[PDB]
Amino acid sequence: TNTLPHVAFYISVNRAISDEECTFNNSWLWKNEKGSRPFCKDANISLIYRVNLERSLQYGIVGSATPDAKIVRISLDDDSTGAGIHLNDQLGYRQFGASYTTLDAYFREWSTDAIAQDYRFVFNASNNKAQILKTFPVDNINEKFERKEVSGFALGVTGGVEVSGDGPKAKLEARASYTQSRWLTYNTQDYRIERNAKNAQAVSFTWNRQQYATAESLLNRSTDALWVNTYPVDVNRISPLSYASFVPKMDVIYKASATETGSTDFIIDSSVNIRPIYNGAYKHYYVVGAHQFYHGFEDTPRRRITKSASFTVDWDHPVFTGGRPVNLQLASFNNRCIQVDAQGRLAANTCDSQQSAQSFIYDQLGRYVSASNTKLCLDGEALDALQPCNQNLTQRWEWRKGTDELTNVYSGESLGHDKQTGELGLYASSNDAVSLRTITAYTDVFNAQESSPILGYTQGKMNQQRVGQDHRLYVRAGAAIDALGSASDLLVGGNGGSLSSVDLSGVKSITATSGDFQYGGQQLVALTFTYQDGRQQTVGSKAYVTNAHEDRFDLPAAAKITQLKIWSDDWLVKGVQFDLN
Amino acid sequence: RISPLSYASFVPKMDVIYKASATETGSTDFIIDSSVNIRPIYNGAYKHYYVVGAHQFYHGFEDTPRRRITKSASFTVDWDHPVFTGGRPVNLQLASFNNRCIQVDAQGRLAANTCDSQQSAQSFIYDQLGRYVSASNTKLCLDGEALD
Amino acid sequence: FCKDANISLIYRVNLERSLQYGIVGSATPDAKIVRISLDDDSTGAGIHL
Amino acid sequence: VDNINEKFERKEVSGFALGVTGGVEVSGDGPKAKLEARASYTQSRWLTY
Amino acid sequence: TNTLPHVAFYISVNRAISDEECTFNNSWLWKNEKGSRPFCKDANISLIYRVNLERSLQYGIVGSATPDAKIVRISLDDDSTGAGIHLNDQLGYRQFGASYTTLDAYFREWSTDAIAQDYRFVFNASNNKAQILKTFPVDNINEKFERKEVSGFALGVTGGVEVSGDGPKAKLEARASYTQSRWLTYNTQDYRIERNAKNAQAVSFTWNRQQYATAESLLNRSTDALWVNTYPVDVNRISPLSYASFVPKMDVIYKASATETGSTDFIIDSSVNIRPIYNGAYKHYYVVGAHQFYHGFEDTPRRRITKSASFTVDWDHPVFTGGRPVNLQLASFNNRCIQVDAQGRLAANTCDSQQSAQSFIYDQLGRYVSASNTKLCLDGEALDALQPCNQNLTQRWEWRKGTDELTNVYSGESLGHDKQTGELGLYASSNDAVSLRTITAYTDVFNAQESSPILGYTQGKMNQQRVGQDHRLYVRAGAAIDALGSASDLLVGGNGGSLSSVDLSGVKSITATSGDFQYGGQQLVALTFTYQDGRQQTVGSKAYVTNAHEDRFDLPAAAKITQLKIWSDDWLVKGVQFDLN
């Protein structure tokens, strides 16, 4: 128990990708003539972040080289990976010859499987109370370079003789050649590392294509004659890493000030920018013959497909104290541990393994401190309540070996408790109605709060609104979803929606669907509260939606939902979360 | 041909250690100054026309100015602060009372008062010689001849 | 010429003696030490243009 | 500690070549024959860092 | 205390470099036609060395690997750096054209910032008693080599056929070629490491320009016609290390013989050689035209700028005993430690932590040895004084555990002392007038003697002249500082300077100016004593010096100076050092 405590867990992130999101038009230059098609089969998103939270030091220690602070560790490496990111399993193409009888134009075209341009992840906190401490990919490397310089001069002499009937000839020749050149070489990676930071709250890692960075760079050859028909798109210059499957690596650590108090959320953006390839051939003609000059068409759009996640730190959580706590039990009963309210009065009640208000901290000074409040502490002057604690010696307590009682320093007076009321008093010796038996032990209060999955997008204003006493989510949404709130006044965003009030308690689940919502951009396309009986209350559109994605988000029934987290612009909501019990 | 390290994001790495003399006293500040020099790139084409034709000769006008945007901070050290003493101080509790610790003034008189975890003048240093010394100053230390 | 330029660095400040109190004849001569460090363990966000 | 002093790289090469060629041209106007020799020498300096 | 003790401390050398020292003419070939200007900007010298010193082995240990001797280490490394060496904070030049109309000569020239040709460090000992044990720059580098060799032979055949209206032609050829060549390859450094140990008392380390050793190695072009007017000197071929800031690194250790007794001084000398660049272009006005053959005039003078310091070792000092000492307290009193004089008689006095004559050494033989006198040991036969050490058991002593009495083996009886006089005796039992309380502990005596800074130049004849008992010195100085001493017969230097006699008792400071003395040489140019009052006595003249370096050397009040460390040769006076107490 003398080691550094921790609180850590794993967080999943998973998203299937249906065909339509991957579907693009067939050819580029002839964009609309041949129509569209899927460009990747069975694309998948799966990954497991590692979340860890700690105090930078054991409680009570003084002047260690490590400065006092609170540390947040969001990371993955070998130890924890998840499955990964996937686009394709093979490399399928499709040829398209001359649409018409061509005179001079791009005439032979090929459209093959899509390839990943780049991968990206964005981490940021809900507020500015915490700052980035440090991050594994310290920073892209100031590349090594080599420069070579070559200078030389030639001095040649040639003795030649020709012999023939007309007349012999002789030759003496001198050649003086001077030459200089420079060489500059370096190294590149398949996918370049690139970190970008927006601010002391928002940071982004990214991996982008560096080698063969453009489609036309993948040309398997240079060119050919006018008539040569051959599939000119190599694959062997493509790492299967680039398209098939991939797993990232990342370490980020946020700092938190010792004196800070409150709570905050942390926000996770995983994204991949998908793009097909488009290589064509213009029959570049010189008057005699021609050549299917090939040139990549990189103007074809790229769709960034993303998923988001988040979680919550409550800084006042006991773990940040820096000392493994224990309970305190009136051993006369079979189950009576000391609990503390918010105000300061103390009770003896049922014992809980996860009761902070029943948790306590032992120190070098022999005091005892609330995990819920480092301020108040135990003192024998008035056991009815605890006080903001300091060097008052009467706060201090000592164990007597082989006993079941704890003693006070001030005058050796022992601690006692009546067999009925759970009172705490100080006495010289136990009486008939007061027992001294009292034992403690370490307990877990550090299992993290369960994850709350998000639905939509982590863009637009972040707003937490307490679920109203009226237990009815009020919405400005009709066929389009503009604004949300706990009441008709707590809207943020647009106004064009209809006025709706939805029951929140007694709800079995929420089927919330987002995606390509016709009213503009990617947003929560519809809400459908599946109540306790299973009945549906629907606001939004399930018919103006394409590329939809839905969640049937489930709770214990009749759960008193507590807060509403919206990610929403002054027009529409594109992110919804229900901060749980 | 440009790394992101030039424009997008960067982090530095360095270490400095300032030396201070044996027992020089008083106060001092240390000053940190961060600066980045910003400058765009201006490149154009020069019409070098030989009588046959003109080639667009490209030249980057490196004479474009620069702006060194800076920020700064500072902090303070007091040598007499117990940090440079070299030992872990402790209080002295007049254990008859619930809260009394002995404290030293500037002149030398010693008073029993409420305690403070963060009171230099209530803190003291233990040594190999079995003496007890003012954590505020190595020059002052306790003796039983005149405890006042 | 650049959107959202930002500066945010963090620095580690250390203060220490070169030796335990009263120790004699060690390797390191007595002095006072100010340490300003910026490396792996403590860097902060960085510089953006 | 310091601005880096680095390690330069220097190559220097002296070369000399000796070639001999014997050719014959044949045509209607008349056969001709040539025998010739070449002697080349050159210094080369290389620097890398 | 079981660890081997040490004595170590930091010594700072600091020297400002005023503008005039870095001032030179505005051109080389045109000495005065453009005048002069400064070539530096706040050039500075600031280093700190770490001087340690220690016995080669703990006292009493016998037959170990390392033979007994004394060690003085002087180090400049990772944790012993200083600030550095500074010349400039920018890259600068200055165009200059044809002073007069030219026919065929150099006509275009460029002034440049001054560049460190080399850095040097001189390590010296005031006599031969010590020796140069070892040096971290073990030695100059036996540098490896690469030697390729190539032999080649060519065997080509060729069939060439021409066809035209004149007549078909055919030809066949055979080429036989042979060639041989050699390749040599090796590596250099910017400022090559070169050490020169001049002799068994003095060593020199140096880092000198090796790559690009000439200004002509800085060209960017062979030559051109009149069309070019370009400052032809690159700066990128110059490291920032070359000119702006530099920090050295090296380590030296001096050996000292076991049996020697006495005292000695050690001398640290730092130096740079400064030199600007003077490269120009000769317009070789041939019939071909004007070709500006560039040339670097490596003949431009080079000025060495130096600073120095020194310090003092006393072999007789207790540090080299090899065992941490303790005191001896007649604990009847509150402040009474036993002190030993030079002759042997003993006293009881107040206790100083730093008092050698109260310090003592305790060995396996249970003896006690004076730190200042390794020859002497306490013996119970006669406690009035110590005796030369031997195997006499009565010299030996033993502690009684858990007690305060240190007793003697011979017959076992204890050491005693009367409560009044501090006498020592041997007694079987304590009496009324004799106390037995006797305690000790380790006491620091290992602080270093403070450093006496130096002014002038550490060259010329070195000598020591004990300050006359009158505490008043005699000089032959006039318009020039010729000879110095503590008496008219004790002059070192010439004799041309006029007679002078200046009091030394009660002097607070000296305004001493040295450097390029106008009338002759680079030495101590003038002195002005400043008594405890603050008045001035002048010898030499501040007006009769060029490029003066002036300093205000200051002392603790009314310090009885003991001797003069003087460096003068027999012509003038080169340096000064008044031994402080």
mmCIF file of C-alpha atoms in Angstrom, chain A residues 146-163, chain D residues 32-49:
data_model
loop_
_atom_site.group_PDB
_atom_site.id
_atom_site.type_symbol
_atom_site.label_atom_id
_atom_site.label_comp_id
_atom_site.label_asym_id
_atom_site.label_seq_id
_atom_site.Cartn_x
_atom_site.Cartn_y
_atom_site.Cartn_z
ATOM 1 C CA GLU A 146 23.934 14.894 -45.935
ATOM 2 C CA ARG A 147 25.617 17.176 -48.455
ATOM 3 C CA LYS A 148 28.500 15.938 -50.586
ATOM 4 C CA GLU A 149 30.650 18.117 -52.833
ATOM 5 C CA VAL A 150 32.523 16.808 -55.873
ATOM 6 C CA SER A 151 35.193 18.694 -57.809
ATOM 7 C CA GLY A 152 37.507 17.233 -60.406
ATOM 8 C CA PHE A 153 39.518 18.028 -63.526
ATOM 9 C CA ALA A 154 40.613 15.727 -66.384
ATOM 10 C CA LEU A 155 43.931 15.875 -68.327
ATOM 11 C CA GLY A 156 43.859 13.405 -71.219
ATOM 12 C CA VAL A 157 46.262 12.816 -74.101
ATOM 13 C CA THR A 158 45.419 10.814 -77.221
ATOM 14 C CA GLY A 159 47.832 9.419 -79.781
ATOM 15 C CA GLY A 160 46.013 8.324 -82.922
ATOM 16 C CA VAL A 161 47.202 6.925 -86.245
ATOM 17 C CA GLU A 162 45.245 6.115 -89.396
ATOM 18 C CA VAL A 163 46.881 4.155 -92.213
ATOM 19 C CA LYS D 32 41.196 2.214 -94.358
ATOM 20 C CA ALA D 33 42.746 1.241 -91.031
ATOM 21 C CA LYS D 34 43.416 3.197 -87.843
ATOM 22 C CA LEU D 35 45.385 2.417 -84.686
ATOM 23 C CA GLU D 36 45.161 4.862 -81.806
ATOM 24 C CA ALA D 37 46.024 5.329 -78.137
ATOM 25 C CA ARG D 38 44.640 7.465 -75.306
ATOM 26 C CA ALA D 39 46.223 8.538 -72.013
ATOM 27 C CA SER D 40 43.999 10.316 -69.486
ATOM 28 C CA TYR D 41 44.864 11.676 -66.022
ATOM 29 C CA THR D 42 42.619 13.542 -63.558
ATOM 30 C CA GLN D 43 42.467 14.688 -59.921
ATOM 31 C CA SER D 44 39.226 14.613 -57.928
ATOM 32 C CA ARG D 45 38.245 16.210 -54.616
ATOM 33 C CA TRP D 46 35.240 15.140 -52.531
ATOM 34 C CA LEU D 47 33.894 16.799 -49.391
ATOM 35 C CA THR D 48 30.900 15.708 -47.327
ATOM 36 C CA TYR D 49 29.233 16.912 -44.140
#
